[PDB]
Structure formats: structure tokens, C-alpha cells
Amino acid sequence: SHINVVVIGHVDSGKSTTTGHLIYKCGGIDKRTIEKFEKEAAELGKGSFKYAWVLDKLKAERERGITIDIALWKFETPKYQVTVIDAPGHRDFIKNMITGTSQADCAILIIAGGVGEFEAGISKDGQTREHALLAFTLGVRQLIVAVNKMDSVKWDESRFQEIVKETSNFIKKVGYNPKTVPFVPISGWNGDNMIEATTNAPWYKGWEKETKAGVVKGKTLLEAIDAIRPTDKPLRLPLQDVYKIGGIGTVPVGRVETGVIKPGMVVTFAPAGVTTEVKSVEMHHEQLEQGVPGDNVGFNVKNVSVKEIRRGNVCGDAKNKGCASFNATVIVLNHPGQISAGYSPVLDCHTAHIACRFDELLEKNDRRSGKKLEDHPKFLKSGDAALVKFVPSKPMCVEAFSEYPPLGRFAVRDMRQTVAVGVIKSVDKT
Amino acid sequence: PVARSWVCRKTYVTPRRPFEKSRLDQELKLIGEYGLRNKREVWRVKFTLAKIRKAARELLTLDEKDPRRLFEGNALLRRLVRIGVLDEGKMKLDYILGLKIEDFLERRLQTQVFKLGLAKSIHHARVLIRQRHIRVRKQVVNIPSFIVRLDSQKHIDFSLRSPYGGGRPGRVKRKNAKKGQGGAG
Amino acid sequence: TVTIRTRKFMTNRLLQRKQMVIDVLHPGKATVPKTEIREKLAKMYKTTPDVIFVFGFRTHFGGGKTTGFGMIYDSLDYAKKNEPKHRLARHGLYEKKKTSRKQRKERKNRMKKVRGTAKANVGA
Amino acid sequence: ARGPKKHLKRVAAPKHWMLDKLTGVFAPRPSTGPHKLRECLPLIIFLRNRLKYALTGDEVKKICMQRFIKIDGKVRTDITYPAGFMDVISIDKTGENFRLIYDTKGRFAVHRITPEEAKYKLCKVRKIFVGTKGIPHLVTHDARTIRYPDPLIKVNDTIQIDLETGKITDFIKFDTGNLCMVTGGANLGRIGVITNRERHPGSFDVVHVKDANGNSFATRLSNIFVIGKGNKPWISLPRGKGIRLTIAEERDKRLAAKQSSG
RNA sequence: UACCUGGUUGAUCCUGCCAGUAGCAUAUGCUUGUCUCAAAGAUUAAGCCAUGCAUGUCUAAGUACGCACGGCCGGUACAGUGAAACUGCGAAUGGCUCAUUAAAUCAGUUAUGGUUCCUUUGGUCGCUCGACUUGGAUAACUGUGGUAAUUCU
RNA sequence: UGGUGACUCUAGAUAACCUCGGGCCGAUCGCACGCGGCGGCGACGACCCAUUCGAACGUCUGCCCUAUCAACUUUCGAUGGUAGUCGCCGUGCCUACCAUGGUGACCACGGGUGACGGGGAAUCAGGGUUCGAUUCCGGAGAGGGAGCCUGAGAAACGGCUACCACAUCCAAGGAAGGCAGCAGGCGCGCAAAUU
RNA sequence: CUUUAAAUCCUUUAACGAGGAUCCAUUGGAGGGCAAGUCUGGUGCCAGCAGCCGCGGUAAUUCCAGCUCCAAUAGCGUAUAU
RNA sequence: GGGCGUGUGGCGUAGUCGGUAGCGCGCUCCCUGGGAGAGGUCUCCGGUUCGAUUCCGGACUCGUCCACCA
């Protein structure tokens, strides 16, 4: 089977390094290509980023040493064909982190074990807490915590147990069940305990997590991934990029959130409003008979220009609607001021990136009990929960949370953060 | 090398002067009296008259007793008498020149429906061709430009499948009957 | 009330069958399917309906006449001997290959690259 | 052409095959043999188009290897064999024998011959070849190299071969008073008697031949093929007997048959 | 259907061109109900090409020790299919394009007594004055390898 | 002996020759098998003679514009005589030796061609004018030219060997390429389809 | 059902299926050449029209609109070739 | 989509120690010239702040260029 995994975590926690090295040991990349990246990285004074260079393809990413856009790579496990979605750990690029997490079925939270790094990551200003919250808010119910950089602390057990304890209390407040989350001590740089059990941690007997089939045990991070698809739902493949290949034509690229895409299917592009036939579906330069949930495919479309469709657009089956307005329950997290009617921030629903206006603040409810406190409040502040009517600036496709969960959850952003996250209750379809 | 026809012949000829009053009237008298659909089929029938008249004219330039004039002459007069254009009593090659444009206009099937009196109108006669309401020799003809021959003149009649003939009643009667018993209980 | 007659009946001592041109008279109703033609021709010659292979039908305008042509055999062994392979499957008694023509060639010249016994091993 | 061709077009094929130009792009290329590609008749045409035994060419493929076809003594398996002039095609399972004689036009007439007439064939010699030991030879029109002939067989004599042995029985002199088969050109398909020989030093000679009903004509000797003595042939003739009445009378004859039947 | 009309002048007869008029293609514009047919990267670039594909082939009857199947009647070779490989034959046809070329190509006409010619067909092939069947390679296959890499070995 | 319009044709006789990179003269195969030994259907294999398939060269006649192209061809073959070589063959095809011819006011030679030729298409009273890259025949060529192998048949290109242009992968040592084939892509464009 | 290798379309058969049969035919013109308003208002040698001749300088038969009308009719205009 | 800018009246444009919202054409009115007058979502909200077009953040709008060969 195929599964998607998004790597999230605080900046410099070793996300790209752990991911690039995991892909290497799984045979996803040949040794000579790694040796090339190691030389190029050394020439820029960054020899300690040879594995991150696997994911960082943009010049701006290699120059700053931080991940900016989403990188899609593959490798196989004894049970699944995994597609990793390396998400940026910097605040300015949380938008790309949301469109990448709304895809993944599972999330690997990279936490640095070094002294000072962990505290900075779980701080009120750390992204470790914001990422896990966004992951759970976007649909990712399965979580894997990888305590990276265990080599800097000489694989100290008390330090690992400390990180596991605090992380458990945190993820529990977010909504996750600490018992269903495996904690794996690793070293993204040395490659310790990633695919093979490390000898530097003789105290570590392995992780254990509760599943619907019982208790599963393991030791490595690869085994944690093996211990991890809405194919029955309408097709929803938003675009990440749009390519113009000579001889082939226009080839949009993206990941399949729900449903299945196949050659010959009549698809519709929203908000563009363009319907055409899919000629072929490819996955890493190999043609497929079909793209199921999870596959980051590149499909060729007929009679459609690269100017008619762009990044942010959502593709779907034309035979199996748009949104004029939708009421949704939102929770203000961090907003330095007040949220009044007219406020038009950007909402990240599944992989759609549209600016929606807080048309009307219907009700203000208590975040814990859900009981209504005030009708038609003048404004909202950090900590408040409320039922708000939204109106997208551009055509957008959303569904009720109760009917289609993957398309019913979204994120609100502004003033340096994710000011709110919510679930759609009802939708007024066009 | 692909096996197909690529043989085209235009069945009509547009006139040289397009905007003179004299020729404009005559064809208007031919459309309205014979129920035609455009001016093209006026010149189309005028084109096939120009084919036969020229084929008759050059036969006169060949002198008499010539077998080619004797064969192709008698071959041409064989078809003119079999389609009800020229009578047996005027079977000779000199008479083709005096044959006029309205002469073929009787032998359109549409006129024969207003000639045999089974159409209220010559313009109603074409619709009986269009709606597959009449047949000739147990063969329905959905085209009015069928050139009826002299032999099938007595075989023109309503089709077998026709409400106006011996067939099923039409949709209007099947619709005026469903409320004729559905409104009465 | 569909009555079938004969046209152009001649023997095939060279082909171990008989061939005659089918004429149909179906007034008021549709072109009758080829299955019901066989048993009607079977009782018209008092022979077995399984070797009656009619095809090539063509209606005349307005209906009432459709014109086809078929072949009736001597026995079923010749009916499997001298016949285009598709006419067997038109009854649904023979199953042909299920391989797409491109899939035949894309494998075929891929056996031109490797010399040896591995020609049968490259495919799947 | 960097060598010999292998194909033939449906439009460039000879018209006496009477090939529908709408069915296929190509024509069945006649294999090389005892008769040229012009005056041959490939066996696929004889089965599918003249007698309608088979409907497609692959339905001739199953029947040709059924070994039922006997062209002039031999059983051929190639459908593209050039069955030329007076090749006796006998078919066993019907017991039916056939022979190619021209019509009044240029085409080949579908003629059933009697079994007592199917065992022998007339052939025109091409040259008197002298073999390597003072051994006289002859090549017929169908490429039959016959050794030790009757020495009175000259260049334009016709000889009567038995197919069961491949040997001569009697010969017919090129002399005035003999029946003739005009084979080639505008007079292809006429049967008449020899009237006069016109000599030509250097070019092709011509002989004038009068038809039986006085329709006298001429044709060069290349198309001339004598078949009989006096007024009697040595083979069975199809209807019309090669007289070539003008198109005035075929129209009368055609209407006469439909007015007598109704 | 061998057909003209307007424009020099104050007006006239003329020379006389210009412009209309009817075709036939190529593009293009507006519009578009049915149905049968059917041209379609020639003009500029005989300019440049990704991918894929268009030339292979076995009969009772050239060479079968791949169990890869498979029969048992088995020890007198092989049931028989049979991949591979060897041999034989085709790949010189067909398709595409029109750059060159102005008695050249080509067309009609003939000449080859100035020439070769696979196959087919038909003749030959005990005509010569000395084996109951001769020799040794080699592919497939078994087995060890190279080179980043090829329809390399 | 026999033929042609005319042979140095064919056959015959003779006197010899039999090319070591050699002219043939079964050192095959299968199904039925019946009478020590004799057979049947064939398959296949060849050398030679015809046959067909062609090609190759010749004969005669036929081409578009142009004189601001009137003289050209020529010992670097131009037209011939002689004798060879080469070639499958005739012949300046080439080589030798002699002769001085060969073409042109009947338009040669030269240039242009937005020129593949022809059947043909469009237009027309009659006469013509224009078109014909385009399915039929034939020619010519597969980036540009040159050279060859194999085979009956190629100066072959979905066969090789060079140079020239363009262009692909590399581990930098090398290797490989030819859509004016079916589609398709860019470019060129006023202009032309589905990998 | 038929068609065909398998289809598609054509033809065949049942069911529905138009009253302004709103299931709504355009393209060019309306001074002459050349079939077709001395219609109406705006425009005022301006914008523009028209292949040609020619029209516009305030009552435009030639511009722009509407109404009407004319030719051809699923076609027609325009460009360029002949 | 990565980096840079541009947005303030009908037009295009100023400007702003953070405090008054402009000029020019335009439309209005007055005697091409001059005068007065109408005319603003300072892209947007949220704060910072005694007072925000400015100060901050955010995305936005358009223009710009680097990327982008399933």
C-alpha cells in the first residue's frame, strides 16, 4: 500500500537531514548523487548539510540553509511505498507546511534532543507546538515522534525520558493519544536507529504503540513507519505547480488527497472553472493506470494552457461544487489584536489556499464546553471559540466536516502566526 | 495510396449576371409554382438540361447514318421516353432542342403528389415526402428530388407506415387521446 | 410473422458448406437479430442450428427489408476449419488473445536487446 | 527501383481482371511464370471473382493448400500463379474442368470443358532451338521446352500436347485457310480464318483475318495463334464464338432477352 | 448561353485603360440543424527531432541431449510440442519527400544480332574409364569475468 | 544440322587448354511400406538451356524564360581513325598514338527558373491561357558530400567506413546517433489532424 | 437489434418529444455601376464611407443607429493567385 | 511560487520627525488666461501609539526578474 508522511518540527531540529539520510539508506538515492551534493555543500561552507541538499533544490534554500518549499521524495518500506513531504520549519513558510500536512496520512515530529534546542522548540515561540497542533487540526491523526540529535547529548537516557514526558503531556493537550505515538531516539546525521538498531543506545529496548489491532512494537524509525486512504471519496487533487513540457503539453503536478485519478477521466479545475480530459498520469517518470490517495503525480491534460491553471487550484472529477459561503467553528490561537467582521485572512482548507472574509460572527462559544456565551459578538480575541460565516474571495471548494472530514478542516493565518483553526459545519454550495 | 473516390462534380452553375430583373422573375415563378427550396435547384435542373441539350446539339453536327449518331442518339432518346419527359409520338433527336426547363419540373415527385390529388397543397406535398408518408413501388422515398419515371406513375401512393395511409396514427392523436381518456377517468 | 426465403443458393463442395444470400421480410418491426435467423433457417432445411453463420445484414430504407448473407456448414469440424477466427467468437464459443497490440510490440522488440535464454524472462 | 518490384496496384492492374477499385489499394501481384503479367489470370481471381467460391483472399488460402486445384496437370499451392491461355483448371470435388479462352472482348470466358477435351491443349511454338548434340527443341507459348519435335514444326506452328504425358500428338500448320485466335491489342478475342499474309522485312509481319460473318480485320502475327483446320477448331468454344458484333446489336439482344422473359 | 455595364466631356462620336461581373484555389472573417462522401505540414525550413513504432520468418519433411513441458509401450536414437542457437530466405520491396536536374529527367516509338538476370515454369542433370556415407570446428547451454555505459563481449 | 531481312548464330568435327582466392556430376528430409534385394508421394539441393520478372543502355521525336549570353568545345577528351584496358556488355569509358575536328542565326554555348517529367486539373463558343510538390507510371534523394561491404539485384542509409555541420550520456577513459516512414514536438510561418 | 476484428454513424423498432412549433438562420448590401426607402434621429468636409464614380461645410437617398427592404441560403463576405 | 518594488481623489501623482490629508488635469461656478468649488475605503484590518497614510506584522493588487523538462 501507499502512505504519505510529512516531516514537521522546529527549525534546525534536523528535519531535512533526517529525511534526506532516511531516503539514502532506503535506496531512494544512489551513493554517487550524495557524493556530489556533499562536494557542492562543502564548496559553500556547509558540509554538514549534504543530506538536506537532497530536498533543498531552490537556490534560496541552499544559501540560507532552511527549507522553503515542499519537497516530494519516495523510498520503500517492507510494507508500504512511502512518499515523504518535507515541510519547512520556519514561521514565514508555515503556509507551505499546511498544504503539505493536509496531504499526509501520518506526521513525523522531529525534536532536537540537545540542551537548549528542545526548550526553544517547545517554547511559546517554538514551532514544535504549532506544527503538531496544525497536523492534528488538518486531519493527521497518526503521529511519530523522532528525538533527533541524540549524539549531541551522548545518548543520555534521562534526557530522552524527559523529552518523551514533556512531549507526551503536550501532544495530549493537542488531541493525540500518547499511547498511539511511538517515540524513537535517532541521529539524522550519523544515521543511528533509522533503519537499523543503534548500539549507542543499549538502554533503549524499543518503542510501543497501541493500535486498533493491538500493541505493536519496534526499535527503528523505519519500523515506526511500517507500523502506520480515502479512495471512496470524490477526486480532490490540488495543484502544487504547473509545467509546460515540449511534445507532451501542459502537465499539472500535485498530490491526490481523496478519490482516484486515471487516464481518460474528465476533470474540472477550480477556481479556474476549466474542464478537460486527462491523457496520462505519471509518478516519478513512470506511467500509472491510476493515482490513488497519496501519490504525488504529474498528469497531462488536453487543450489547456499553463496560464489557465496555477498553484492553489483544485482538480476533481467532473462527473462526481463551488462554495458561496460556509459556517464554521473556529478557535482563535494567537492574534495580537481583535478579529471583527470584515477581517479577510487566508484559509488553508485541504490544499486550497484562498483568502476568506469573516463575513459574520454568529456565535461566541466556550472553548472547553462548547456552550454558547454570546450572540453576534463585536469581536474575537486569542482563546475564544466562535461560529463564523465565511465568504471566499475567489471560487473555492469545501465540504462539511461531518460529511467529508479531509475537506472540512482549515487553518487561519495572520500577524506572525496561525491565529485560528476550524471545522466547517455547513456549506452554501453555488 | 488510399482507396477512395476523389471524384467531384458540381451539380449546378451560378448565372453570369447575379442582379438582373429578367432572370430574377422567371425563377421566382418556378419556385412558387413548383414548391422549391432555393434558387440553386433551379439552375441544377437547368444544368442537367444544358448537359442533354449539348449532347443533342453535337449529334446534329455529326452527319446522318453514322452509327455513333445512330447509337448515342437512340440511347439518349431511350431514356427521355422512359421518364415521362418526351412522348412516344415525338421520338426524334431534333425535338430535344425544343425541350424546355419546366418539362423536367413535372417529373419531380413533389409535383406528382399535387398531381395525383393526395396533397392539399404542392407545398403540403413536400412534407408528405419529408415525413415518410408516401411510398413508390413498396419503397418509401424521403427525398423530393426523386425523378419518377413513366412506369411507376400508377404506383405512387401513401406509405404502409403512415397515419395518413394504412399505418399507425401519429403522435398528436396519441397525445390528444391520452387526455381524452385521462381527463374522463 | 417474419418469413425468410432463398436467394443465390449454391453448394460448396470446395469449402464443405453451403452458401445462400439471406433476405428478411419484417413488416412493422425491427431488424430481427442474427440468433433467431439461425433456428429459422435450421427448420427451413431440417438441419442443426449450430453451424448456421449469418452476417452482413443491410436494411433497405423505411424497413420491411434487410439483406444479409450467411454460410451453413456440413459439420462442426469444417466450421472450425475454414472460417475467420472472429466468426467463432461472434457466437461466444472461442476466446482469443487478451493482449493489446502495443503491449505485443513493446515486449517484442524488447526481446531484441537481450541475447540468450532471457528472452522469456524479460516479460513479467 | 533498386531491384525487382513485388507489388501491383489496383488501378495499374490490367483491366481484363475487372477489379473493383473501391475494395483494396493493391492488386494480387502475379508470380513469375510461363505467362507474362499482362495476359495472365492469377488463381485468386478465378476462385473469388469469376466463380465466387471464396469471399476473401484468406478464404482462398485455406482452399489452395487443400490440394484440390489442378492447373494443366500440376497441383499448385500459390494463389498468385499466372494461369495463362488455355490452362486446364480441373477441380476434383465437383468434377468440373475449366479452360481459359478469350471472350468476344479482351476478358477470359468462364468455359467448362468436357473431360475428353480437358486432357489435351494446343500450344504455339516460339522458336526452333537446336540443342547441344544436334537435338531440335521448341518452346511453346506456356514455356514448355519440348525436345525432339517433328522436324516440320516451324516457328509459327501450333501443336497438341497431352497433359498426362507432356508429349505432342499432332500439329497444325500456319497456312491460309486455318482458324485463328487473335490474342492481343484492339482485336484481342476474335476468332477468324486466315485470308492473306503480308511480309515485312525488318518489322513485324501482319496477316489479315476475316471473321466468319464477313467482318474482316488485320492484326500482326505476334497476337495471331492458329487453332484449327479449315472451318473446324480443336477445342470447345464459348457462346458468341468470337465474332465481335458492334454495340448496336448488343442493345437489341439485351432488350430481346428481357422482353422474351418479361 | 459565342453577353457586357459605370468613370475623361458643356455635351458628342472615338482611341483607351481603370473598376465592377462569373469561375476556380489558399488563407481568413461571421454563423452553424441533419446526412453521405472527402482534401489535410507541398509552398517558408530537402530546417531541427524526444518518446513509441514501422522487417521478420517452420513445415509430416535443414541442425532438438533446455525435463521447459509431457506420454508410458521403453532401453532398437528421439512420444511429440518445443524457447534458445545454427542454417536458409527476405530486409534492394513498401512508404515519405521533390532538393537537384532544361534533349537531361521523362513520354511515344523501337532496338539489345551490344547485356546480365534471385525466384517461378519447362527442359536437362548413369553420357567422364577411376561409399552400407569420410574430416574438424562452433553457437545455444554449463561455468569464471571485465567496463560508468550500448543490440559491447 | 536448323534458322534470320542480314551472324563471327546454333550444332558438328578437330588440335589443345581445365585458372589452387578451383564449373557441375545429391556424402540431404519426411510419411505411407509392399514385393536376396526392388518401390511410391514428394520436400530440398544445385550446374546449364529457355521462360517470366526486371534492370541496364542505345534509336527517332518532343521541352520553360533570356542576347544587358554570339560564338563555343578542346592536349585536365573536345569530334574522330587505330589498338588495347576496364566494365555484365556496345562506345573516349579510360590509356597510348595519329588526324583536326565538333556545335551555332533552324538560336548553339551561357544564365534564370518561386522547374521532378508525363498521364492529367481549373477555365473556356471556337482557338487557347494557366496549373500539375500531391495517391498512376517513371526519375531522383534520405543532414551535407565521398567510399564500400554483402548479395541475383544497392553505391542501400529503419546497412556500414570517412570528412563537415548539428546533436546525446559519461565515472571525462569513451560510447552512440540520421521521423524528406506512422503519429507526435519545436521552429518557420498567412497556411495544415490523434504520440 | 444491426453494423464491425471490436465498435461508431447510417438504416430498423418501442417510449417520450413544438402554437410566439422562444427547439428563434445568418452573411452582405439598400446613390450609380447592381436587385433593393428621397424613412427617422444623431453627425456637420468632423468622425467616417465607398472596388469605381463619388457622399459628408447643420434639412446626408452614400457616415452612425433603429425600422423597413434587396440578393444568396447553411452559407456568405473579405484578401491574394490565376 | 523565491527575492525586489508599485498602490494615497476621475486621471496620474505628491507628501508624511506619527498629528493639516494634496497638486495638476478633470467636473462645477466665475471674469486659451485666472479665480473659487464639488470631489478620498491613503489596498485592507489588527495592534503599537496621547493621536497612524506613515511605525510593525500579515497576505493582498499589479509590474519586475530568478526558479520551475511528469
Answer positive or negative: Cα dihedral of D184, D186, D192, D198. negative
Q: Which three cell numbers stand for residue D159?
A: 501443336
Identify the CA nearest to A378 among candidates A411, A342, A410.
A342
Q: Which of residues 74-113 of C touch strand E (CB under 7 A)?
A: 102, 105-106, 108-110, 112-113
| C-beta neighbour count of D248 within 10 angstroms | 12
D94 → closest Cβ in C13, C82, C84: C13
Distance of residue D192 Cα from the nearest chain C Cα, in angstroms: 37
Closest among D244, D254, D253, D250 to D216, alpha carbons compared: D244
Closest nucleotide to B19's CA, by C1' atom?
G35
Q: How far is D83 from chain B (nearest CA, A)?
A: 27
Q: What is the rounded distance in angstroms from the CA atom of residue A274 to the CA atom of residue A242?
A: 14
Amino acid at site B139 = Q
Instruction: Name the architecture of domain A1-228.
Output: 3-Layer(aba) Sandwich (3.40)
DSSP string, A343-381: ---EEEETTEEEEEEEEEEEEEE-TTT--EEEES-S-B-
Contact yes or no for D157/D127 (Cβ under 8 A): no
Beta-strand relationship, A2-9 and A81-86: parallel
Q: How far apart are the first and last CA of chain A?
A: 36
Q: What DSSP line would sit under A52-71, residue for residue?
A: GGGT--SHHHHHHTS--S-E
The phi, psi pair for A155, rounded to 5°, reads 50, 50
Closest by CA to A260, choosing from A290, A239, A283, is A290
> How far is D52 from D81, CA to CA, in rounded Å?
18
Query: Which residues in chain B are contacts of C61 at CB distance < 8 A?
Result: 139-142
Bridge partners for C4 per DSSP: C24
What is the Cβ-side half-sphere exposure of residue B67, based on CA atoms within 13 angstroms?
5
CA atoms of B139 and B127, how far apart (whole Å) = 17
- Contact between residue C38 and residue C91 where contact means Cβ atoms under 8 Å apart: no
Helix (H) or strand (E) holding D108: strand D108-112
The closest alpha carbon to C52, from C38, C33, C36, C40, belongs to C38
C-beta of residue B81 within 8 angstroms of C-beta of residue B91: yes
Question: What is the grid cell recorded at D150?
Answer: 517433328
CB-CB neighbors (< 8 A) of D252 in chain B: none
C-alpha–C-alpha distance, residues C112 and D184, integer Å? 52
Give yes or no on whether A1-228 and A230-318 have one common fold. Answer: no
Which of C86, C88, C69 is CA-nearest to residue C78? C88
Judged by DSSP in three states, D192 sits in: strand
Measured CA to CA in angstroms, residue C91 lies from C17, C54, C88, D144 at distances of 18, 11, 6, 51
Chain C positions touching D91 (Cβ under 8 A) are: 14
- Residue A91 to residues A62, A95, A97, A140, B160: CA-CA distances in angstroms? 18, 9, 9, 20, 84
Q: Where are the domains of chain A?
A: 1-228, 230-318, 321-428
Contact A163, A112 (CB under 8 A): no
CB A358 within 8 A of CB A377: no
Burial class (CB in 10 A: 0-12, 13-18, 19+), A375: exposed
Residue B28 CB neighbour total at 10 angstroms: 13
Q: How far is the C-alpha of A204 from the C-alpha of A196, rounded, in Å?
A: 13
CA-to-CA separations, A191 to A150, A186, B153, in angstroms, rounded:
11, 7, 100
Residues B73 and B80: their CA atoms lie apart, in Å, by: 11
What Rg do the C-alpha atoms of chain B give, in angstroms?
A: 22
Tell me how far apart the alpha carbons of residues A316 and A322 are, in angstroms, rounded to a whole number: 12
Contact check, Cβ <8 Å, C61/B159: no
Instruction: Reduce the secondary structure of chain C to three states and give it as a string.
Output: CCEEECCCCEEECCCCEEEEEEEEEECCCCCCCHHHHHHHHHHHHCCCHHHEEEEEEEECCCCEEEEEEEEEECCHHHHCCCCCHHHHHCCCCCCCCCCCHHHHHHHHHHHCCCCCCCHHHHCC
Closest CA to A276 of A305, A296, A245: A305
Q: Percent helix, strand and coil across chain B, each rounded to 5? A: 50, 5, 45
| Cα D233 from Cα C68, distance rounded (Å) | 45
* End-to-end Cα, chain D, rounded Å: 57
CB-based contact B140 C62, cutoff 8 Å? yes
Element (H, E) at A169: helix A157-174
Is the CB of residue D86 less than 8 Å from the CB of residue D121?
A: yes
CA atoms within 13 A on the CB side of A171: 29
Residue A17 counted as an annotated binding residue? yes
Contacts of B50 (CB under 8 A, 6+ apart): B13
The residues of A between 165 and 224 with beta carbon within 7 Å of nucleic strand H are none
Tell me the C-alpha distance between A261 and D252, whole Å: 74
- Name the nearest CA neighbour of D73 among D114, D112, D117, D118: D118
A263 touches strand F (CB under 7 A): no
Q: How far is CA D123 from CA B170, C72, D142, D182, in A?
A: 74, 42, 7, 14
Is B15 near strand E, with its CB below 7 A from some atom of it? yes
CB-CB neighbours of D249 under 10 Å: 10
Return chain D residues 187..246 having CB < 7 Å to nucleic acid strand E.
Answer: 202-203
Residue type, A338: Q
Cβ proximity of D88 and D118 under 8 Å: yes
Is-contact A394 A355, C-beta < 8 A? yes
Phi/psi of residue D99, each to 5°? -150, 140
- Rounded to whole angstroms, the Cα distance separating D179 from D181 reads 7
Q: Which residue of B has its CA nearest to C61?
A: B140
Q: Compute and round to an integer the Cα radius of gyration of chain C.
A: 21
D63 and C14 Cβ atoms separated by less than 8 Å: yes
Burial of residue B137 (CB within 10 Å: 0-12, 13-18, 19+) is: exposed
Contact between D74 and D83 under an 8 Å Cβ cutoff? The reply is no
Omega within 30 of 0 (cis) for the link into A271: yes
E-strand ranges in A67-115 read 71-76, 81-86, 106-112
Please indicate if the annotation marks A212 as binding a ligand: no
Find the closest chain D residue to B5 by CA distance. D22
Quick one: closest CA in D to C78, which residue? D62
Q: How many CB atoms lie within 10 A of CB B138?
A: 13
| Nearest of D92, D174, D90 to residue D126 by alpha carbon | D174
CB-based contact C4:C22 (threshold 8 Å):
yes
Which residue type does C104 have? R
- CA dist D116 and A218 (Å) reads 99
Residues in chain C: 124
Residue type, C15: L
Per CATH, the architecture of A230-318 is what?
Answer: Beta Barrel (2.40)
- C and A interact (at least 3 Cβ pairs within 8 A): no
Report the sign of the C-alpha dihedral through residues D30, D33, D38, D44, in that order: negative
- From residue A74, alpha-carbon distances to A31, A57, A295, C25 in Å are 16, 16, 10, 67
CA end-to-end span of chain B, whole Å?
A: 69
Which of C82, C84, C75, C71 is closest to C20 using CA atoms?
A: C71
Strands C17-26, C3-5: pairing kind: antiparallel
Q: Tell whether residue A189 is among the known ligand binding residues.
A: yes
Contact across the interface for B139 and C62, Cβ inside 8 Å: yes
| Per-residue cell: A354 | 484562498
A151 CB and strand H closer than 7 A = no
Residue C2 CB contacts under 8 Å (≥ 6 apart), including other chains = C24, C25, C26, C29, C32, C40
How far: D202 CA to E114 C1' (Å)? 18
On the CB side of A208, CA atoms within 13 Å amount to 4
Asked if strand F comes closer than 7 Å to D214 Cβ, the answer is: no
Smallest Cα–Cα separation from A248: which of A280, A288, A277, A272?
Answer: A280
C-alpha–C-alpha distance, residues C74 and C15, integer Å: 9
Is there a contact between B160 and C64 if contact means CB atoms under 8 Å apart? yes
CA distances from D26 to A238, D13, D78 (A): 54, 9, 18
Question: What cell numbers appear for B184 in the block?
Answer: 374522463
Q: Nucleotides on strand H with an atom closer than 7 A to protein CB?
A: 1-3, 44-47, 57-60, 66-70
The separation, in Å, between residue B20 CA and nucleotide E14 C1' comes to 29
State whether residue A30 is helix, strand or coil: coil
**What's the gap in Å between the CA of D59 and the closest CA on chain C?**
7
Q: How far apart are CA A173 and CA B125, in angstroms?
A: 88
Q: Which three cell numbers stand for residue A365?
A: 462559544
CB burial string A38-76: b at 16+ within 10 A, e below: eeebeeeeeeebbbbbbbbeeeebbeebbbbbbbbbbbe
Contacts of C81 (CB under 8 A, 6+ apart): C16, D62
Query: Resolution in A, one decimal?
Result: 3.7
* Beta carbons of D34 and D142 less than 8 angstroms apart: yes
CA distances from D4 to A127, A218, D1, D8, D30 (A): 81, 76, 7, 12, 13
Assess contact for A21 and A188: CB atoms under 8 A: yes
Closest-CA residue to A84 (of A6, A8, A197, A185): A6
Shortest distance between the Cα of C79 and any Cα of chain B, in A, equals: 32
- Identify whether the C-beta of residue A325 lies closer than 8 Å to the C-beta of residue A428: yes
Report d(CA B41, CA B35) in Å as an integer.
11
- Ramachandran angles phi, psi of D170, nearest 5°: -155, 165
Burial B42-52 (b: 16+ CB within 10 A, else e): bbbbbbebeeb
Q: Position of cell 482458324?
A: D179
Q: Which residues of B touch C (CB under 8 A)?
A: 132, 135, 138-142, 159-161
Among candidates D218, D202, D199, which has minimal Cα distance to D210? D218
- Burial status of residue D170 (CB atoms within 10 A of its CB: 0-12, 13-18, 19 or more): exposed
Give CATH superfamily name and number for A321-428.
Answer: Translation factors (2.40.30.10)
- Which candidate, A394, A23, A66, A406, places its Cα nearest to that of A236? A406
Please choose, from the candidates A277, A302, A18, A331, the residue with its C-alpha nearest in 3D space to the C-alpha of residue A146: A18
How far apart are the C-alpha atoms of C50 and C55, rounded to whole Å? 14
How many Cα atoms sit within 13 Å of D11 on the Cβ side? 7
